[PDB]
Amino acid sequence: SMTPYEDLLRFVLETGTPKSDRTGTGTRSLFGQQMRYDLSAGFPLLTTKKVHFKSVAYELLWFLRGDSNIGWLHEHGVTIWDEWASDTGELGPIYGVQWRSWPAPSGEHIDQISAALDLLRTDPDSRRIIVSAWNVGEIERMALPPCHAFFQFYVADGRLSCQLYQRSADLFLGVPFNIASYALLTHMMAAQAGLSVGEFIWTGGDCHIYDNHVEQVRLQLSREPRPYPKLLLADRDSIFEYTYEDIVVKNYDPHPAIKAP
Amino acid sequence: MTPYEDLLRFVLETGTPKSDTGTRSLFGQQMRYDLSAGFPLLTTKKVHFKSVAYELLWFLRGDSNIGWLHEHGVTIWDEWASDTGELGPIYGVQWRSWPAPSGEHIDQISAALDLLRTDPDSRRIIVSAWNVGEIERMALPPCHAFFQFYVADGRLSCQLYQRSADLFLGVPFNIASYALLTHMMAAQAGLSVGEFIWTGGDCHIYDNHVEQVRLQLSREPRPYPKLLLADRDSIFEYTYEDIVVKNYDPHPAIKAPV
């Protein structure tokens, strides 16, 4: 179909502002960019390169568990968080802790995921259906400041839309994964709320391509997309009860993975 | 370029209807303005920039009370205030004094300025009003919830995430407000201005604003004004008189319906 991601990737490659961070890393970047995907037309797992959906799905279930220790990821062979874990596998109060138990001054702890699902079911027109990981007073404890910092849901004509704000975006390595993650989340929330899927909107702050990814990006940009796959979910009575085996990505026909430093 | 009017028209013509006051709405929309080419105070109606400027200065004070705003002839917040003029820890309180677990209070405005001066390439220059645990204490939940700064070639850009947007009444304020904030931050960080990017969640036109919108949309847009800021040693020392808008030549104000 269409290629919102590839278009943005190309746009930053071709018009992005050059930078270097004293260490000499180097980037090309644009600020405040936006992609939309119509989820009803297909699941936005990129086909111009294979995206490792297994890690996407496990990491999401891990967030949904409200988990802060990489142990569970490791058990399932997901190593993306390994770099930043403590000697004990702890990461501080990151996404999972904030999504499921943001500490309030009242001493209460807020499960934003259940709260959002309750709004989707009882007050679907609410303009306050929001989940934030950007807990200003806790950031320094986290291993890293939240990248996908907050998201908002919206309902129209029985369809659920979701918009993510992502403060920082490695367009080549990170974003394809980020897109799959929040699209998957949107399917889970929709099913649990008794809704169909609408749009996923990705809004980025600093959208950058690392200089050492440029060849990988040009190869990908030279490839023609296949149709998006179809996402299927087994039945569960709670979003917190989805397991990896409940998820099928059907008819995913990607070009080969591109390995990048 | 008139992103505002374009968006307003887009929603009027394609927004999905709702109830119940009643709206037309679209979700996840974005506008961008090049601040170096003009100050985005709308000209298709006379915007009450006095309220915009005072409200922003008031946010910067980190005030939870309407008094200072109210006594300057700005009454937009009056209806939501308590007996004492109190609002709970809204916008400015979070900007200037987000309460941390340590008992410390975080001044996100000063911290943002700090990064802009010492580490302008940072991808974490963020100010948030969306304090999940304190929103129940606020008179109403933050609308312009979260914003981010970015620097390229000595120019400061700013992106606002606005969760909910009354397109006719609120957005022209929101746009001018953050544009003005971006000028203040740039001047204090010793940068020039780049782009203001407005990103909206629920973007709506109220059914009782439809005629006002059609009137606004029938007017031809004019050249944007220019903003000038007198010099100050601190963002917290700007006054209303420091803020000068030149060449502002708008069509007539359009009264908010009762």
UniProtKB/Swiss-Prot annotation, chain A:
Statement: the UniProt record of this protein carries the keyword Methyltransferase: yes
Family: Belongs to the thymidylate synthase family. Bacterial-type ThyA subfamily.
Residue numbers binding (6R)-5,10-methylene-5,6,7,8-tetrahydrofolate: 52, 170
Alphabetical list of HAMAP family matching this protein: Thymidy_synth_bact
Keyword terms of this UniProt record: Antibiotic resistance, Cytoplasm, Methyltransferase, Nucleotide biosynthesis, Transferase
UniProt-listed InterPro entries: Thymidate_synth/dCMP_Mease, Thymidate_synth/dCMP_Mease_dom, Thymidate_synth/dCMP_Mease_sf, Thymidylate_synthase, Thymidylate_synthase_AS
Organism of origin: Mycobacterium tuberculosis (strain ATCC 25618 / H37Rv)
GO MF annotations, alphabetized: thymidylate synthase activity
Predominant location: cytoplasm
Other remarks in the entry: Mutations within this gene have been associated with resistance to p-aminosalicylic acid (PAS) in some PAS-resistant M.tuberculosis clinical isolates and spontaneous mutants. It seems that functional ThyA is required for M.tuberculosis to be sensitive to PAS.
Active-site residues annotated for this sequence: 147
This protein's pathway: Pyrimidine metabolism; dTTP biosynthesis
GO biological process assignments: dTMP biosynthetic process; dTTP biosynthetic process; dUMP catabolic process; methylation; response to antibiotic
Reported function: Catalyzes the reductive methylation of 2'-deoxyuridine-5'-monophosphate (dUMP) to 2'-deoxythymidine-5'-monophosphate (dTMP) while utilizing 5,10-methylenetetrahydrofolate (mTHF) as the methyl donor and reductant in the reaction, yielding dihydrofolate (DHF) as a by-product. This enzymatic reaction provides an intracellular de novo source of dTMP, an essential precursor for DNA biosynthesis.
Localization: Cytoplasm
Activity regulation information from UniProt: Is potently inhibited by 5-fluoro-2'-deoxyuridine 5'-monophosphate (FdUMP), and by the folate-based 1843U89.
Protein name: Thymidylate synthase ThyA
Induction summary: Is expressed under the exponential phase of growth, and down-regulated upon reaching the stationary phase or under both oxidative and nitrosative stress. Expression of thyA is significantly increased within murine macrophages or under acid stress. Is expressed at a higher level than thyX under all of the in vitro and in vivo growth conditions tested.
